[PDB]
Amino acid sequence: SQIPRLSAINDLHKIWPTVEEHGAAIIESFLSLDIVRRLNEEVDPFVKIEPIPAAKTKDHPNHVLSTTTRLVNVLAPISKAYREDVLNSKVLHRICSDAFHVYGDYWVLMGAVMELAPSNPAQPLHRDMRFSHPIVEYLKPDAPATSINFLVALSPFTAENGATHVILGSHKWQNLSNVSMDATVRALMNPGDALLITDSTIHCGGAETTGTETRRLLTITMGISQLTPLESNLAVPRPVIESLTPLAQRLLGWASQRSAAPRDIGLLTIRGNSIEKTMNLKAEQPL
Amino acid sequence: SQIPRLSAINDLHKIWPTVEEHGAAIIESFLSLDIVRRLNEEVDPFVKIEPIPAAKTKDHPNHVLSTTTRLVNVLAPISKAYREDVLNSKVLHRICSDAFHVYGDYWVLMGAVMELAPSNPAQPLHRDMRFSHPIVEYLKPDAPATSINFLVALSPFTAENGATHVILGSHKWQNLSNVSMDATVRALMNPGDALLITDSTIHCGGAETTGTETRRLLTITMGISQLTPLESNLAVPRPVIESLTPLAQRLLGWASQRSAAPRDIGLLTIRGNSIEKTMNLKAEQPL
Ligand SMILES: CN1C(=O)c2ccccc2NC(=O)/C1=C/c1ccccc1
Ligand SMILES: CN1C(=O)c2ccccc2NC(=O)/C1=C/c1ccccc1
Ligand SMILES: [Br-]
Ligand SMILES: [Br-]
Ligand SMILES: [Cl-]
Ligand SMILES: [Cl-]
Ligand code: NI
Ligand code: NI
Known part of the structure; x- marks a missing residue:
């Protein structure tokens, strides 16, 4: 059976x-075609100048991505459409608050544009986060998802x-001996559609x-703060x-964060006060 | 039997x-009395001006600590002894690299001076991190410690x-029905001695x-990056x-971080380059 399709x-x-049941869902028109057009226009040059993932010039080379792949992250300074429209997406924030309520505040682990060159080979079947967060492999099998990925x-x-490709129900798999391309279904999508998966x-x-x-x-990898x-x-x-919303500032790590603990003592605090209170960070200031 | 005592x-x-076996150890003369004297002198005024943990002026009040308790964190700007001697402690870094090698890079989750007023009541028996990192409760029982605390x-x-008070062996407990002050031993310590416990x-x-x-x-709560x-x-x-060592800069989140994944793609990176490379952050520059 196919990936469930839902209206934003x-x-x-x-x-x-x-997603909690099937491990994947397609959000039709997650971004409007206008937002997709502005996003594409803004990142276009940064994609073209991006070297190979494991470029000898990099002190954090990505040895995993194919040499044909170009990944551009830290999009906030590149893209008005990203920093304004995407970071304040009502649909993204509803899904993330639904997903992460047990843990508390969430933020962007990575927002990246990826361009795959012609004849780019298929990636091996994988779970995300295994090249950055070894901790996630030590979570109890039934632990609520600590990150999700909007593709x-x-x-x-x-x-x-x-x-x-996704394997539906594979987010609940412990034994991986049935992992095969035979078990996958495809995310056929128009520009602005999003495939949502868990870690x-x-x-x-x-x-x-x-x-x-x-x-x-x-x-967009969204994860607990x-x-x-x-x-x-x-x-x-x-x-x-300071041009962003307070919510956008929090998502980029320019604010303190809260856990869901009843008497939460907070994250990235400064002697009991927030980053934003301490540094007197203003918001929604046009450039 | 008593908390094991070891020479730094x-x-x-x-x-x-x-610590891995017993869940606690006393490191005799972890800090020299000179470092303790300079640390005390430097933080003294900041302890005196610190309001109650849950002060109505704070937007991140600590509702857990007793009203008599004063906690001062973000010590780097307050204390030369902290930023230079403590953050570059050969003993701290050996223990942390021993503790966290399975995960990768570690940093300071919190360095805080705590002053307890006369007649301060005993805290309830607890594990740390439960008011800030709900995620840690979802780790497999046998998962290596993701944070440790130098008291x-x-x-x-x-x-x-x-x-x-500590309960020796309690770091391996799953059933907590035997938790009682009856089961505890004390950390009797001279200034500069450290009690090391896990999360x-x-x-x-x-x-x-x-x-x-x-x-x-x-x-000093040291935790995986x-x-x-x-x-x-x-x-x-x-x-x-920029007055700190590169290692001290990393511990304060002013550098990119690495996981222990064989093909690690890194944390807090900027399009495949480090914070320190990107921002051209210099180190060991006297003020
Ligand atoms: C390596 N790698 C990435 O770089 C990446 C890229 C975008 C978003 C998340 C992300 N994290 C990963 O875990 C990842 C997986 C991955 C596995 C197999 C092949 C190629 C990638
Ligand atoms: C609340 N609380 C802190 O503030 C604290 C202080 C210093 C270092 C770590 C730390 N984190 C805690 O988990 C914590 C525990 C705790 C439990 C019971 C009573 C009082 C404290
Ligand atoms: Br893809
Ligand atoms: Br104590
Ligand atoms: Cl790829
Ligand atoms: Cl207390
Ligand atoms: Ni992936
Ligand atoms: Ni404690």
Whole structure:
């Protein structure tokens, strides 16, 4: 059976329950085509200048991604559409608050644009977070998901051009001897549609088989504020940060965070006060 | 039987193995009396001006600590002795690399001076991290410790003045029906001695029974770089940060971090480069 498809408008309350059951759901029109167009236009140049993932120039090379893959993260300074429209997505925030209520506050572990070159091979079937957060492998099997991944199509996802594979129900698997491409279904998606998976969903990028098509996606890993992001916004200029909403500032680690503990003592606090109170960080200041 | 006592000089390799077995160890002369004297002198005024833990002025009040308790964190800007001597402690770094090798890089979750007023009541028996990191409760029982706590005496720890209680072996307990003050032994310590416990060691601050003695400690929670610190150094001036060693900068979240994954892709990275490379952060620059 196929990946459940849900409306961002009509089925909002059904999205997280669907992922919790099946380990994957397609959110049709997660981003409007206007937001996709502005996002694509803004990141275009940064994708073109991005070297190979394991470039000898990098002191944090990515040895896992194929040499044809280009990944651009820390999108806040690059993209007005990302910092304003995506970081304040009503649909994203409803799903994340549904997903992470047991733990507390959530933030962006990584927002990245990925462009796959023609003839990009299929990724091995995997769970995310295993190259950055070894801790997640030590969580009890039934522990609520500590991160989820919105794979947003920025170009068409087809069977031919390497649309994502998922194994439905694999987020609940402990024994992995049944892991095979035989067990997968595809995320066929229009630009702005999003495939939502958990950190336990077994999945992979598909094989690009046309030899002509370039596939692009926005991957948003949302995780509990108790886990360290893969990416830093420490070098984002304060003018850009102060142009954001307080919620967007929190998602980029420019605010203190709270756990769901009844008498929570907080994260990234400064002698009982928040980052934002201490540094007198203003919000929604046009540049 | 009593908490094992070890020399910082002679028994360095024995410290972590001792804690892994018994859940607690006393490191005699962890800090020299000179470092304790300079630390005490530097934090003295900040302890005196610190309001009650749950002060109505705070947007992150601590509702757990007794009203008599004063906790001062983000010590880097306050204390030269902390930022230089403590953050670069050869003994601390050997123990942390022994403790956290399975996970990867570690950093400071919180460095805090705590002063307990005369007649401070005993804390309830507890595990640390339960008011900040709900995630830790979902770790498999046998998961390696993701944080440890150095409770460094800055004044004498006596049975009379509320020396820490620990239950030896309690870091391996799953059933907690045997938790009682009957099962505890005391950390009797001279200034500069440290009680080392894990996030699973059942322990409590003791009852101050003299009505005259003020007890002070430096608590250093060291944790894997995959867990978010309780405290932020985001507001520490760049001059102070650039006065530190690269290792000290990493411990305060002013560097990218690495996991122990064979093909680690890193934490707090910026398009495959480190915070320190990106921002051209210099180190060991006198003010
Ligand atoms: C390596 N790797 C990434 O770089 C990555 C990229 C985008 C979003 C999350 C993410 N994290 C991963 O765990 C990851 C998985 C992965 C596995 C197999 C093949 C290629 C990737
Ligand atoms: C509340 N609380 C703290 O504030 C604290 C202080 C120093 C170092 C770590 C730390 N984290 C805790 O988990 C904690 C435990 C705790 C439990 C019972 C009573 C009083 C404290
Ligand atoms: Br993909
Ligand atoms: Br104590
Ligand atoms: Cl790839
Ligand atoms: Cl207390
Ligand atoms: Ni993946
Ligand atoms: Ni404690």
